[PDB]
């Protein structure tokens, strides 16, 4: 199907760019939102009884401000999220009242019955603490990751290496049109491989999410022309992200990304991509692209020293 | 023109047997052939002559001559009217052969 | 010879067995001065020269002031140069992470084997194309069997950062203990990535008072905010959504809650008098964040011949 | 031929005013029109479940 | 005719790369070429002369002219008679003014 193909391409494109109001208006009922529609809007090219989305489904339709808050809780890392919470709390005591939360959520109302029942009681009184806040953070992130995992049809509770590589390359919204060839080659490169159990990809995704600190943690490798390595990646993931990584996952990431290199995975190869994609918070599809391409080409050409 | 034909042959061969397969390079050749067939018709549309090798060569030679003669300020008009008078006087001498050598009546003009 | 090593050998002052070295005075000059003209030439060394140089740490103060105290009788190689250079721009809450990174946990402290691992990283990156420095003698004893705990590491890094702030303050205040608001204004405008400071100079001429001073603790607090600017902007991105310009009180509360460095009203008043291009009392994050973007000030030159590439990117992206 | 029956030279070939521009102002727009025709016909054929490539 | 060739190029090149594949569109192109050959032969069968560009243009122009002459009640016969008689009279006058003969005095 060609027409449905271009429809899904345009939906994915409007998902990638111009998110805040255009997406929320693009998915609705009949001005509010529904949880399954939210899940549809957060997944590209596309009732629970145990999920968070079930709890919201029991609750009333989601608001636009709630949508913004959900985007931020999905986006920001853990430490920055703790800082954001500390900024949420206006009063001294470490508990966000319903009134101050209402103020800092109404501050987003620019185009001029919420998730409160999950944070507060039906009386809209029960104030929460930082512990419940981080618990909701972790629960929502693990839940969306579980949903994405199960969307890829698993075998024996496991996922082909090509599928994991495709999910990874889809996480960083970069269309190199050449890394897809590496994704395709990963299958034969890992002929009759393992199944990449959910815990391995979970650990790798939490590590990738906590990369803003990983970058500054290995800053000595930068400023020295150094390049990454298997053991060093193991170490930095164990120290900063505080989680283990199986050697197979590091192997498949190396095989996916270290294309120009010979197994070293320098800054421009892997870390820069994720560090830039984590900062998404800041025919027309030809001008800017061609300009950037030409700029890079001219820079590479002029790269002939003094 | 010969060098350009050879260059296109080489480009297509190299890109057909080394980098990309023939399944990718067949439509390129077909559309190059059709574009050539269309250019050979636009040539006739805009020059009112069919695209033949000697006629195209003669037209290009004439354009080069009539530009080099303007650059050099050569009195082409006097040259033509002077080369037509020698032709007229020799046709007259050829005509005057009958009544002066073989004593036959003179041939009329034409 | 990479750009960093080229800069290091340019600012170096000692060579020994075909290996350039550096004294704390040259490190400070490389940190605070973009280019230095060396009137004299490099000089070689012997073991007697090494001991004459290392005879300073025994009578040096391990407090807040350590480099100016050492003066010229110190020794720093390329690896320690890069290590200190990364320390200069390392924000807080990365100290413990950097400490745990510098050791495989077979040692909860740091023995000199881990700095040997750092030097091995450097040498492996170099080749794939013995000598005691002052910093090792500070962390580890003259014998070489000394454990380095985390608290001492944090103390040393804080002392180095504060020493650099004091140096820049005294370099911009000409010696006095109260620099004029104009000096802080020009120090800010130095590294801002704009092409016409004329509007900011008009602002400081018109809006800013004729005479007003800035203390030292305030300058240090502003420098710490500048070095935590990334976390500050991550916290402020939620507020930047809906494009809501932030006032002064909320700015102060936010910087206090995100960086732990409470600022005075004088510095905030000044930075809003220089940076408020519009007529409102407070302006959005646009100018302050996007303009104050590099943070690569104070030496730290990144000379990847970016002149012509910058001109090309300007000609391209200008639309 | 480049000369007449006598030695005179042929007159200059009469060129068309802005010939290449006048031909490329006809080739390209009709090329795009044909592209549009093909796209619309393919879409109409695939929508009604007549011919689907795969 | 040129615009038709252009739009055929476009309508054939759009399909082989965007919508369909070359494996589908190659026989269509071959049969288009063979139909063009059949049409160029039918042109000869109908007009009793080979299909070349200048001759076809001249034939079309003659048809257009002889239709416009009948639509406007033009007298082609008297025009041709005058155009032949003028040439005949000019030939007579040029032959009577022959410099080699003495049909006239020196004047
Ligand atoms: C969806 C996908 C599909 C996409 C695809 C879309 C495209 C498909 C459709 C294609 C159909 C197009 C058909 C139309 C073109 C045919 C027109 C034609 O033949 O007219 C006959 C026309 C009749 O001539 P004329 O009226 O007797 O006067 C002609 C002269 O000789 C000139 O007068 P002169 O006496 O001054 O001449 C001097 C002399 C020498 O030249 C001069 O000195 C004269 C020029 C000086 C200027 C002085 C006067 C200027 C005033 C301009 C005239 C008025 C307006 C025209 C100018 C506007 C131009 C925009 O001239 C010559 O040498 C003539 C030969 C020209 C050959 C040059 C061809 C260059 C090609 C290079 C190949 C690539 C190189 C490899 C690089 C390697 C990379 C590392 O001939 C020309 O005009 C010749 C120029 C045309 C070039 C040759 C054939 C063109 C081939 C098509 C290329 C298309 C691009 C392909 C892109 C591919 C896809 C991305
Ligand atoms: C100052 C001068 C500097 C000049 C520098 C430029 C040098 C190159 C200029 C271009 C040279 C043009 C010469 C001819 C090009 C290649 C020959 C071409 O005709 O080959 C054909 C391929 O065609 C070409 O690829 C496209 C045709 C485009 C024709 C328009 C060209 C513009 C005319 C330029 C005038 C000078 C032409 C000189 C020709 C002798 C073969 O296909 P074919 O199957 O056999 O077609 C049948 C040919 N018939 C009809 C005669 C039998
Ligand atoms: C000799 C006299 C001259 C004759 C004329 C010669 C010139 C015509 C012959 C040229 C052949 C055409 C070659 C063009 C290649 C077509 C490839 C392209 O059109 O198809 C793409 C395959 C479409 O992919 P898509 O993703 O859809 O859209 C992106 C288009 N991009 C890639 C160009 C940006
Ligand atoms: C009153 C206003 C009228 C408005 C009408 C506007 C639309 C009318 C135009 C419709 C088309 C008529 C002109 C057709 C000319 C294009 C066809 C030809 O040029 O293309 C050929 C392709 O042919 C076509 O595909 C089919 C030809 C069928 C012939 C149709 C009979 C035309 C009768 C009307 C003649 C009008 C004058 C034509 C000017 C040449 C090129 O392919 P090729 O292989 O290289 O042929 C080699 C040519 N040789 C043999 C002379 C060297
Ligand atoms: C002028 C130049 C023209 C060039 C030619 C263009 C041709 C365009 C495409 C021509 C038709 C395509 C035919 C392909 C048909 C698909 C075959 C498939 O569908 O199998 C069918 C199953 C059998 O076809 P069917 O539906 O039975 O046809 C009925 C017509 N009969 C009765 C004459 C046989
Ligand atoms: Ca074929």
Numbering used by the authors:
A (entry chain I): 105 to 134, 145 to 160, 189 to 254, 276 to 445, 453 to 476
B (entry chain C): 239 to 348
C (entry chain J): 83 to 211, 229 to 418
D (entry chain E): 48 to 101
E (entry chain D): 239 to 345
Reported in the publication:
The Ca2+ influx is mediated by MCU, driven by membrane potential and using a uniporter mechanism. Patch-clamp analysis of MCU currents demonstrated that MCU is a channel with exceptionally high Ca2+ selectivity.
In conclusion, here we report the structure of intact MCU supercomplex as a 20-subunit O-shaped dimer of hetero-decamers, with auxiliary MICU1 and MICU2 subunits attached. MEMMS has a molecular weight of about 480 kDa and an overall dimension of 210 Å × 190 Å. A pair of MICU1-MICU2 heterodimer appears like a bridge across the gap between the two halves of MCU-EMRE complex. Within the MEMMS structure, we modelled 2 Ca2+ ions at the E264 sites (MCU has high affinity for Ca2+ (≤2 nmol/L), E264 site is constitutively bound to Ca2+ under physiological conditions), 8 cardiolipins (CDLs), and 16 phosphatidylcholines (PCs). There is no direct interaction between MICU1 and MCU. MICU1 and MICU2 form a heterodimer in a previously reported “face-to-face” pattern, while the two MICU2 subunits interact in a ‘back-to-back’ pattern. The negatively charged C-terminal loops of EMRE protrude into the IMS and are responsible for direct interaction with MICU1. The positively charged N-terminal poly-K (99–102) region of MICU1 and the negatively charged C-terminal tail (93–107) of EMRE are in close proximity to each other, as shown by clear interactions between MICU1 G105, F106 and EMRE E93, E101, consistent with a previous functional study which has detected interactions between these two oppositely charged tails. To conclude, the N-terminal domain and SKK sequence of MICU1 are important for its recruitment onto MCU/EMRE complex through interactions with the C-terminal tails of two adjacent EMRE subunits.
